[PDB]
Enzyme design. Structure first.
Site, PDB file in Angstrom:
ATOM      1  N   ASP A 146      -1.391   2.510  12.277  1.00 22.36           N
ATOM      2  CA  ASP A 146      -1.562   3.836  11.891  1.00 22.36           C
ATOM      3  C   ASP A 146      -0.879   4.116  10.588  1.00 22.36           C
ATOM      4  O   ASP A 146       0.251   4.356  10.671  1.00 22.36           O
ATOM      5  CB  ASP A 146      -1.419   5.016  13.200  1.00 22.36           C
ATOM      6  CG  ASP A 146      -1.714   6.441  12.545  1.00 22.36           C
ATOM      7  OD1 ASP A 146      -2.659   6.688  11.866  1.00 22.36           O
ATOM      8  OD2 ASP A 146      -0.985   7.068  12.583  1.00 22.36           O
ATOM      9  N   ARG A 173      -9.481   0.052   9.261  1.00 23.26           N
ATOM     10  CA  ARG A 173      -8.731   0.215   8.036  1.00 23.26           C
ATOM     11  C   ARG A 173      -7.121   0.289   8.744  1.00 23.26           C
ATOM     12  O   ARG A 173      -6.428  -0.027   7.754  1.00 23.26           O
ATOM     13  CB  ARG A 173      -8.709   1.235   7.092  1.00 23.26           C
ATOM     14  N   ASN A 174      -6.853   0.728   9.959  1.00 21.77           N
ATOM     15  CA  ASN A 174      -5.741   1.042  10.482  1.00 21.77           C
ATOM     16  C   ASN A 174      -5.519  -0.032  11.370  1.00 21.77           C
ATOM     17  O   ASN A 174      -4.603   0.096  12.559  1.00 21.77           O
ATOM     18  CB  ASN A 174      -5.815   2.451  11.478  1.00 21.77           C
ATOM     19  CG  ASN A 174      -5.642   3.491  10.499  1.00 21.77           C
ATOM     20  OD1 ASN A 174      -4.836   3.617   9.468  1.00 21.77           O
ATOM     21  ND2 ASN A 174      -6.342   4.528  10.676  1.00 21.77           N
ATOM     22  N   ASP A 199      -6.943   8.673  14.955  1.00 24.74           N
ATOM     23  CA  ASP A 199      -7.525   8.023  13.850  1.00 24.74           C
ATOM     24  C   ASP A 199      -7.977   6.440  13.685  1.00 24.74           C
ATOM     25  O   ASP A 199      -7.418   5.608  13.166  1.00 24.74           O
ATOM     26  CB  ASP A 199      -6.939   8.289  12.463  1.00 24.74           C
ATOM     27  CG  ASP A 199      -8.033   8.015  11.264  1.00 24.74           C
ATOM     28  OD1 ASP A 199      -9.175   7.992  11.628  1.00 24.74           O
ATOM     29  OD2 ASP A 199      -7.466   7.689  10.243  1.00 24.74           O
ATOM     30  N   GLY A 245       0.590  -1.359  -0.148  1.00 30.78           N
ATOM     31  CA  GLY A 245      -0.060  -0.016   0.108  1.00 30.78           C
ATOM     32  C   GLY A 245       0.761   1.289  -0.036  1.00 30.78           C
ATOM     33  O   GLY A 245       1.806   1.446   0.696  1.00 30.78           O
ATOM     34  N   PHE A 292       2.956   9.739   2.656  1.00 27.81           N
ATOM     35  CA  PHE A 292       4.423  10.014   2.651  1.00 27.81           C
ATOM     36  C   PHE A 292       5.282   8.857   2.541  1.00 27.81           C
ATOM     37  O   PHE A 292       6.388   9.102   1.905  1.00 27.81           O
ATOM     38  CB  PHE A 292       4.852  11.118   3.941  1.00 27.81           C
ATOM     39  CG  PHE A 292       4.558  10.379   5.248  1.00 27.81           C
ATOM     40  CD1 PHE A 292       5.532   9.547   5.732  1.00 27.81           C
ATOM     41  CD2 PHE A 292       3.615  10.754   6.118  1.00 27.81           C
ATOM     42  CE1 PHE A 292       5.615   8.959   7.049  1.00 27.81           C
ATOM     43  CE2 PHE A 292       3.791  10.371   7.503  1.00 27.81           C
ATOM     44  CZ  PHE A 292       4.833   9.363   7.748  1.00 27.81           C
ATOM     45  N   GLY A 293       4.914   7.616   2.965  1.00 27.61           N
ATOM     46  CA  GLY A 293       5.585   6.422   2.765  1.00 27.61           C
ATOM     47  C   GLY A 293       4.740   5.400   1.793  1.00 27.61           C
ATOM     48  O   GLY A 293       3.712   5.837   1.233  1.00 27.61           O
ATOM     49  N   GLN A 294       5.382   4.162   2.008  1.00 29.26           N
ATOM     50  CA  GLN A 294       4.903   2.970   1.142  1.00 29.26           C
ATOM     51  C   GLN A 294       5.335   1.874   1.766  1.00 29.26           C
ATOM     52  O   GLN A 294       6.481   1.883   2.114  1.00 29.26           O
ATOM     53  CB  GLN A 294       5.181   3.002  -0.369  1.00 29.26           C
ATOM     54  CG  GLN A 294       6.781   3.003  -0.600  1.00 29.26           C
ATOM     55  CD  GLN A 294       7.010   3.009  -2.272  1.00 29.26           C
ATOM     56  OE1 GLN A 294       6.651   1.932  -2.873  1.00 29.26           O
ATOM     57  NE2 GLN A 294       8.060   3.503  -2.415  1.00 29.26           N
ATOM     58  N   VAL A 295       4.138   0.883   1.987  1.00 26.26           N
ATOM     59  CA  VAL A 295       4.649  -0.497   2.787  1.00 26.26           C
ATOM     60  C   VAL A 295       4.815  -1.397   1.692  1.00 26.26           C
ATOM     61  O   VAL A 295       3.801  -1.769   0.761  1.00 26.26           O
ATOM     62  CB  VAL A 295       3.328  -0.395   3.713  1.00 26.26           C
ATOM     63  CG1 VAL A 295       3.540  -1.930   4.388  1.00 26.26           C
ATOM     64  CG2 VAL A 295       3.368   0.708   4.748  1.00 26.26           C
TER      65      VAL A 295
END
Ligand code: 0LI
Length: 286
Positions: free
Chosen positions: A166, A152-153, A148, A23, A27-30
């Site tokens: 998160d 989904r988290n 949050d 995903g 700011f990042g990507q997993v």
């Protein structure tokens, strides 16, 4: 790059074999990866992990976000129901943030893919709810506020263990953007407590409100809250004390829990410690 070396957390990047993207964040990507020797006792032993690195076409602010996120993660600590930081790669290459891989992905899509035409029994549903409450109880004990909390988290392991994570959200100018519709069409304001949405006040009690929404998501098997309510209409509804109705096949015991979490007054909402006790009572009974 001149990031400090913390040998305690530092892991050799050559011991990482990157794979399937999981995903794109804000700011990042997993990405999914195989790590070798995450346990120094077994240095040639493979293990499946998830790595967060900077997104494509990243700036200097993104790097600072991933760095700040890494610094916060080091202090979270280890608990069975929160995402576990395994290591980081900060030296002589791109910045990597390594955590345990939860094989079945996020709770929202785990629930959505397992809708009956069933794989999900009511006591397994209570267990998901209870486990998330247990993770949140740990977060509050460490004086950590989520901001949050949504299905989904929360991540799902191969053994159906819940892990609070998160991943979001987009930044506005000086504050987090809760109004921006996510890639998956999610409206984050739908999980916001009234004091968080209307007064910009965040406490463990506002996370309690969010937990009530997450509970609704579990017992609707990944439904989107306020099913057909635009965010503009939602505000009046909340101000005027209207709450979501009991879903189609949701037992009153669990809907009553959601209602306690959604009490207008944060002081009249239960604590995560009381939610763990009430969910354990329901789980034991079933
Ligand atoms: C690589 C990675 C890096 C970081 C994080 C992450 O969630 N970091 C995190 C950052 C902050 C906080 C707490 N703050 C909330 C804000 N708050 C204001 C301050 C405190 C927490 C929390 F868990 F404690 F909540 C977690 C998750 C992953 C993942 C993964 C993974 C594993 N399997 C899969 C399968 C599909 C997709 N992903 N994936």
């Amino acid at each position: 790059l001149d990031l400090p070396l913390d040998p305690l957390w530092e892991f050799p990047r050559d011991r990482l074999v990157l794979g399937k993207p999981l995903g794109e964040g804000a700011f990042g990507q997993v990405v999914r990866a195989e790590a070798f020797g995450m346990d120094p006792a077994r240095p040639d032993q493979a293990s499946t992990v998830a790595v967060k690195m900077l997104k494509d076409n990243a700036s200097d602010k993104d790097l600072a976000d991933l760095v700040s996120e890494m610094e916060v993660m080091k202090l979270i600590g280890r608990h069975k129901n929160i995402i576990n930081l395994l290591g980081v790669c900060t030296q002589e290459g791109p910045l990597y943030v390594i955590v345990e891989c939860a094989a079945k992905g996020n709770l929202r899509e785990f629930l959505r893919a397992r809708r009956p035409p069933g794989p999900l029994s009511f006591p397994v549903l209570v267990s998901c709810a209870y486990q998330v409450a247990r993770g949140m109880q740990y977060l509050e004990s460490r004086k950590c506020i989520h901001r949050d909390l949504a299905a989904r988290n929360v991540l799902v392991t191969e053994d159906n263990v819940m892990k609070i994570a998160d991943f979001g959200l987009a930044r506005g100018v000086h504050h987090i953007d809760y109004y921006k519709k996510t890639s998956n069409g999610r409206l984050p304001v739908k999980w916001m407590a009234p004091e968080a949405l209307f007064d910009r006040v965040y406490t463990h009690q506002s996370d309690v409100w969010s937990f009530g929404i997450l509970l609704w998501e579990i017992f609707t098997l990944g439904g989107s809250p306020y099913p057909g309510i635009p965010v503009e209409e939602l505000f009046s509804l909340l101000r005027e004390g209207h709450r979501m109705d009991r879903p189609p096949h949701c037992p009153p015991e669990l809907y009553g829990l959601m209602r306690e979490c959604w009490h207008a007054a944060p002081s009249q909402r239960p604590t995560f410690k009381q939610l763990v006790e009430a969910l354990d009572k329901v789980l034991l009974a079933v």
